[PDB]
Amino acid sequence: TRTQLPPAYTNSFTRGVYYPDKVFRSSVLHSTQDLFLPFFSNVTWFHAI
Amino acid sequence: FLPFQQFGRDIADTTDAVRDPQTLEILDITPCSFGGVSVITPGTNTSNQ
Ligand SMILES: *[C@@H]1O[C@H](CO)[C@@H](O)[C@H](O)[C@H]1NC(C)=O
Ligand SMILES: *[C@@H]1O[C@H](CO)[C@@H](O)[C@H](O)[C@H]1NC(C)=O
């Protein structure tokens, strides 16, 4: 009785941000390249309703 | 620091605060051996001072 519906797609909103070092930083702004979530992107939305 | 950080840097991009891994106490770093030696000579013709 497993009914399957087409999956939908939601958007990112400035999320998926984390700390990349044990180096404390404060009152500073710097840039770095690493695998992060792209902002305002379509990702797969799953359900179990 | 945060309870997962160990070293701390500033805008100088230098490690200036470390965490004691026996006490969990932040300890600042302060270098030494600063500056040079200048000499005030009144002239070689007169008394040597
Ligand atoms: C995400 O995909 C759906 C279906 O293709 C589309 O309707 C929607 O506009 C897309 N949204 C974004 C953020 O591109
Ligand atoms: C030093 O002082 C003496 C006495 O005034 C003078 O005769 C001499 O020429 C001086 N030497 C120099 C190079 O200043």
Numbering used by the authors:
A (entry chain C): 20 to 68
B (entry chain B): 559 to 607
Passage from the reporting paper:
The spike glycoproteins of coronaviruses are responsible for receptor binding and membrane fusion during the initial stages of virus infection. The spike proteins of most current severe acute respiratory syndrome coronavirus 2 isolates contain a D614G substitution, by comparison with the spike protein of initial isolates. Viruses that have spike proteins containing the amino acid substitution D614G are currently predominant in the severe acute respiratory syndrome coronavirus 2 (SARS-CoV-2) pandemic, and it has recently been shown that G614 viruses have higher infectivity and produce higher viral loads than D614 viruses. In this study we present high-resolution, single-particle cryo-electron microscopy structures of the G614 spike variant showing that it adopts a predominantly open conformation, unlike the D614 spike that is mostly closed.
Strikingly, the structures we solved show that the G614 spike exists predominantly in the open, receptor-binding-competent conformation, in contrast to the D614 spike; 87% of G614 spikes have either one or two erect RBDs, compared with 17% in our D614 structure [and less than 50% in the structures of D614 reported elsewhere, none of which showed two erect RBDs]. G614 spikes with two erect RBDs account for 20% of observed particles. This conformation has only previously been observed for the furin-cleaved protein on exposure to ACE2 (6), including by tomography on virions. With a glycine residue at position 614 a salt bridge cannot be formed and thus the structures of the G614 spike in the open and closed conformation are very similar to each other in this region and, importantly, similar to the open conformation of the D614 spike. As a consequence of the D614G substitution, a tightly closed structure observed for the D614 spike is not formed and the G614 spike assembly adopts a greater range of more open and flexible conformations than its D614 counterpart. The greater conformational flexibility of the G614 spike explains how it more readily adopts the receptor-binding-competent conformation and suggests how the presently circulating strains of SARS-CoV-2 might have fitness advantage over the D614 variant and display higher infectivity.
